[PDB]
């Protein structure tokens with residue numbers, strides 16, 4: 574019984590598009606909100622990331638996995654192929670790092686985890702007077718890639734290599 | 742008498758090319774090194790930056806003054822004119838900052854305070870597969886300039902403006 578209420582609290586937080594207050598949980602699950610307040614503390618000690626906000630609780634992500642630095646080279650027009658490559662294999666492109674001979678290591682935030690975000694990003698970059706960091710670096714540069722597991726990373730690296738992006 | 746020993750200790754530290762040990766000061770000024778050790782503590786409380794090292798004392802800089810952010814635009818080939826401009830008016834070019842439309846604010850260390858350093862820097866930059874940050878930015882970029890006083894900064898800004906580098 575307690576386990577079914579616990580499961581239902583999570584369930585409500587993954588599909589609800591707005592923060593859901595303790596009071597709403599109590600009415601939905603026919604317990605007092607004081608009971609809800611205990612259940613939320615129990616679930617966090619378990620490993621769920623529920624934060625309270627002025628409008629109610631929200632379930633947050635975290636639980637990160639593996640990240641690797643990958644060495645690649647490609648032209649400005651190959652950014653879309655590369656990004657879509659990583660994300661379609663369940664990676665996230667954290668950033669780009671160029672090793673600048675004068676300035677040393679120059680970093681750009683990317684944080685691209687989905688297709689929509691790849692297209693938002695390529696659009697911005699293809700504008701006027703905006704050039705990718707690899708143009709400082711004669712093409713060669715680094716990316717920080719994140720993925721759930723080491724298998725997914727290899728998976729991603731396989732695809733990057735057979736497309737011909739890896740520095741090997 | 743104490744004042745003349747104090748003056749002579751400083752004097753020795755500005756011209757000596759190697760760290761000069763307490764023991765060397767004592768022999769040079771005909772006091773015990775224990776007296777030297779007191780004089781060094783007296784001079785620091787006064788505002789001199791003497792650090793002890795395994796080989797002896799060295800007098801260090803500090804005592805910084807004013808710094809400004811300056812907005813400029815120029816091509817890659819105009820880097821030497823600009824840098825020599827700032828340093829010849831007693832400024833130091835701390836860095837370059839480009840406002841990248843995608844990545845936001847991208848910074849490069851310059852720390853160029855003398856002519857020799859301007860030429861070392863322009864040489865590096867004029868090589869192959871090394872491009873200045875302003876190439877991401879369609880030319881416009883920022884510099885952090887340091888100078889002894891606010892007068893010197895204006896002095897420097899005057900020169901930058903009449904050469905046609907300022908964004909105004």
Ligand SMILES: O=C(O)c1cccnc1
Nearest residue numbers: 652669681705706707708
């Ligand atoms: O800024 C770059 O050079 C860049 C951006 C996205 C993906 N690869 C490189």
Ligand SMILES: O=C(O)c1cccnc1
Nearest residue numbers: 820837849873874875876
């Ligand atoms: O990197 C640049 O764009 C740069 C370097 C030195 C001076 N001005 C600009």
Ligand code: PRO
Nearest residue numbers: 576577579580583619
């Ligand atoms: O039943 C449980 O305890 C866990 C936590 C909510 C989902 N499953």
Ligand code: PRO
Nearest residue numbers: 744745747748751787
């Ligand atoms: O005589 C003094 O006290 C200061 C400190 C050394 C140089 N002049």
Ligand SMILES: [Fe+2]
Nearest residue numbers: 645652655716
């Ligand atoms: Fe890339």
Ligand SMILES: [Fe+2]
Nearest residue numbers: 813820823884
């Ligand atoms: Fe400049």
